[PDB]
């Protein structure tokens, strides 16, 4: 009988091991033990992104945001989901929000967020070109 913390740590190991469905299931067990922890949901969302299930990832991002409205990663992963689902305007807004929150929180992710924004804006422009 592992604790929620142990399950989260096991999921993290499985993630390092690139065992994404297994990791996601572990985070699910963590959520069962304590469903009030936003990080279990954002961790599982990243697994779902790796598994090409952005809709499942999006629902987890929403659950995380209900628990922690200031979550940088929940906004960033939500942006990634929307990008995959071709909701470009919303994706860019979420990535820009992740950028703003990371700044407000004085967090440092190097160039990860601006790089993701650039990818999102390009993808948006390419979608416009693909239609004319």
């Amino acid at each position: 009988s592992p604790s929620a913390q142990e399950l989260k740590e096991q999921g993290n190991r499985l993630f390092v091991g690139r065992k994404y469905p297994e990791a996601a299931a572990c985070y699910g067990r963590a959520i069962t033990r304590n469903p009030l922890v936003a990080v279990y949901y954002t961790n599982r969302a990243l697994c779902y992104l790796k598994m090409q299930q952005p809709e499942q990832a999006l629902a987890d991002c929403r659950r995380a945001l209900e628990l922690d409205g200031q979550s940088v990663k929940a906004h960033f992963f939500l942006g990634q989901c929307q990008l995959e689902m071709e909701s470009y305007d919303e994706a860019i807004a979420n990535l820009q929000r992740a950028y703003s929150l990371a700044k407000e929180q004085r967090l440092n992710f190097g160039d990860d967020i601006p790089s993701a924004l650039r990818i999102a804006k390009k993808k948006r422009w390419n979608s416009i070109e693909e239609r004319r």
Binding site: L46, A98, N108, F109, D112, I113, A116
Partner: peptide
């Protein structure tokens, strides 16, 4: 820290 990673 990298952003696309688990916590």
């Amino acid at each position: 820290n990298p952003i696309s990673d688990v916590d």
